[PDB]
Structure 1
Amino acid sequence: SGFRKMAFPSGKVEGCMVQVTCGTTTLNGLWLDDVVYCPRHVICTSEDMLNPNYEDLLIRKSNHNFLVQAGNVQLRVIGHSMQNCVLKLKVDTANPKTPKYKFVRIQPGQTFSVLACYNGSPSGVYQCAMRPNFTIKGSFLNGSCGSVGFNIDYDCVSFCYMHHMELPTGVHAGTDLEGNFYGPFVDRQTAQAAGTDTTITVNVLAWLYAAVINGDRWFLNRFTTTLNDFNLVAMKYNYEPLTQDHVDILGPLSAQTGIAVLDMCASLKELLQNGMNGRTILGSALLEDEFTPFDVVRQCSGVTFQ
């Protein structure tokens, strides 16, 4: 038993991180087959970032202006192109350690592991969620750009996030691996507004089921509720409204615990209206929304990866 914020094992991703240098700028790249993917703002100086014209900046660059280093192996660039906000550097050597992989654009509320890197080398790994306002609450310093977020399914690494920037508010923004930003953000040093950050209700419920599986049952009450009545309370506290798709996803946790989803919503409503009163749930004094229903099943059943 027990419950932890668990990340995926990172070994398959560690072998894909390289260092990309263009002029004075050095950031991280992802080396899959014979292509390196990195943030396009590697071609900017500190002054260019206030208002970059990426097309005009990229035209003054040739293949030999990019230095790609994988530890002590120097890859030679033989082709380069800009795809949205990502640079694609075609190199002469295909990565031998290339895993089975795919590129995926996740939806808000889904979770993934981040491998934080600096100078092409791994620093640490942690789990996080894409917020409903398309930001992540990460841990990143200058030079972490190009670090990637990923999931693992069976033997396949699904890359879903590449880190680009820290907003003046301290939260983090980035793109999918096709270079499309998550959210309305642009890769330019200007004040940018993220929306209201709401709580991922379906995740909170999956975590309450995890608490029950692990012996924490005090929040369970005798009341019940309806989907419409619950959503009226949830929206007052800036919780995401619950839909029937969410009830279907929670089904397996309902079956394993014998607690109906709407009964769990009733318990949640009282926690919203009356607080936690100095008690804790799974060691936390706050309601936690960084576990999806799949995360809970995974951890509580012991799913492994090849």
Structure 2
Amino acid sequence: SGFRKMAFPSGKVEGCMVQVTCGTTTLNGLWLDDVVYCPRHVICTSEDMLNPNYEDLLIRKSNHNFLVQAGNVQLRVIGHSMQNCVLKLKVDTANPKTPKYKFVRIQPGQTFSVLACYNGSPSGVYQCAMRPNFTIKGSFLNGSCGSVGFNIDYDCVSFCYMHHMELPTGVHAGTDLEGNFYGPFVDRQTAQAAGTDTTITVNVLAWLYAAVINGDRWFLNRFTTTLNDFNLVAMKYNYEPLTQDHVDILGPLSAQTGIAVLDMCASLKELLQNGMNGRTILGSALLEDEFTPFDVVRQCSGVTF
């Protein structure tokens, strides 16, 4: 039993973290095979942060301008190229700790584990979710850029995020491992504002399903709801609209617990108007939205309590 915000074991990602230094800037890089991936803004200088011409800044760089350090070994860069907002530094040595990996671009509401690193060495691991406004609520300090988000289904590490910058609201923005930013952000220090954040409704519903599997039912009710009537109420609480895709995805959890998806939706509608009245669900006085339907099936049992 129990339900914790679990992260994937970070071992396969720790063996890939290095330190990339260009000029006076030092951040982290991801060492896969013979390529080191890092944010391209490592080549920015102090006055190249508001409107950096990355193509112009990169054409002035030679291979020996990039100091790559894996632990205490110093990797020699034998080539470099830019792909969107990430730098790809070709190195002399293939990382022998390179795992079964691949690059995937996730969608809002998806979860992943973050390995917060500084100066190339890992500091901690926690779980995140791509917010609907394409930001993530992470734990990043100065020098954390280059830290990567990932999922480890089976024995394959699916890299889906690389940290680039922190917005003024304290949230974080980054790119996939191909350099394409999540959301309408750019790697410039001009003041950018993340869109208004909404609650990931499909994740909340799955999380309520996780509570029923673990033996908690106080929040259910005898009512149902149409899909449209639910969204009309949910948007008044800043909730992401619930689509037929989400209803389908919740099917297996619905079949396991015996509660129809729209019945769980009516219980959520009631929870939003009543609160929890001094009670908790799975150990929290808020409605958690960082557990996907996929996360619930993996973490929870196959037999309901």
Over residues 10-29 of structure 1, what are the superposed CA-to-partner deviations in whole Å (9 max), with x where a residue is unaligned? 10000000011111111100
Distance in structure 1 (CA, Å) of the matches to 2:195 and 2:96: 42
Question: How far apart, in 1, do the equivalents of 2:303 and 2:62 lie?
Answer: 46
Distance 1:51 1:68, change over 3 A: same
CA distance in 1, matches of 2:140, 2:205: 29
Q: In terms of mean alpha carbon deviation, does 169-178 or 270-279 score higher?
A: 270-279
Following the alignment from structure 2 to structure 1, what is the Cα–Cα distance between the partners of residues 304 and 88?
A: 32
Name the TM-score, length of structure 1 as normaliser. Answer: 0.97
Aligned partner of residue 217 in structure 1, secondary structure: coil
Is residue 140 of structure 2 the alignment partner of residue 140 of structure 1?
A: yes
**In 1, Cα distance between the equivalents of 2:168 and 2:248?**
39
Q: Which moved more, 1:139-148 or 1:238-247?
A: 238-247
- Greater mean alpha carbon deviation, residues 275-284 or residues 196-205: 275-284
Q: Distance in 2 between matches of 1:209 and 1:302?
A: 12
Deviations 1:65-118 (CA, angstroms, capped at 9, x unpaired):
001110011111010111110001001100011101100000000000000000
Secondary structure of the 1:287 match is: coil
What is the rounded CA distance, in whole Å, between the counterparts of 2:170 and 2:46 in structure 1? 19
Equivalent position SS for 1:48: coil
CA distance in 1, matches of 2:120, 2:268: 44
1:161-215 deviation line (CA, Å, top 9, x unaligned): 0000001111000000000100010111111021111111100000001111112
What is the number of residues matched between the two proteins?
Answer: 305
Match of residue 298 from structure 2: 298
User: CA 1:98–1:289 in 2, change beyond 3 Å: closer, same or farther?
Assistant: same
Distance 1:145 1:69 in 2: 16
Q: 2: CA distance between counterparts of 1:268 and 1:119?
A: 44
Higher mean displacement: 170-179 or 250-259: 250-259
CA 10–78 in structure 1, closer or farther in 2 if over 3 Å, else same: same
Is 1:33 the counterpart of 2:33? The answer is yes
Alpha-carbon offset, residue 51 of structure 1: 2.1
1:76 counterpart residue number: 76
C-alpha displacement of 1:48: 1.7
Taking the aligned partners of 2:230 and 2:94, their CA distance within structure 1 comes to: 53
Residue 273 of structure 2 is matched in structure 1 by 273
- Provide the secondary structure at the position in 1 that maps to 2:127: strand
Query: Any idea what SS the aligned residue of 2:212 has?
Result: helix
Ranges in structure 2 where 5+ consecutive residues have no aligned partner: none
Q: Where does structure 1 differ by over 6 angstroms across 4 or more consecutive aligned residues? A: 302-305
- Give structure 1 stretches of 5+ with no counterpart: none
SS in 1 for 2:300: helix
Aligned-pair CA distance for 1:303: 14
Distance (whole Å) between structure 2 residues aligned to residue 104 and residue 278 of structure 1? 41
Q: Aligned with 1:283: secondary structure?
A: coil
Going from structure 1 to structure 2, the CA distance change for 1:119 and 1:304 (only over 3 Å counts) comes to farther
Change (3 A) 1:187 1:238: same
Supply the distance in 1 between the matched residues of 2:4 and 2:76 (Cα, whole angstroms).
42
Provide Cα deviations, 1:127-179, integer angstroms capped at 9, x if missing partner: 01000000001000000000000001111100000000001111000000000
What displacement does 1:45 show? 2.1
Q: Deviations over 1:203-252 (max 9, x none)?
A: 00000011111122110111111111111111111111111111111111
Matched residue SS, 1:116? strand
Going from structure 1 to structure 2, the CA distance change for 1:223 and 1:303 (only over 3 Å counts) comes to closer
Corresponding position: 1:110 with 2:91: no
Instruction: Give, in angstroms, the shift of residue 301 of structure 1.
Output: 3.7
Secondary structure (helix, strand or coil) at the match of 1:159 reads strand
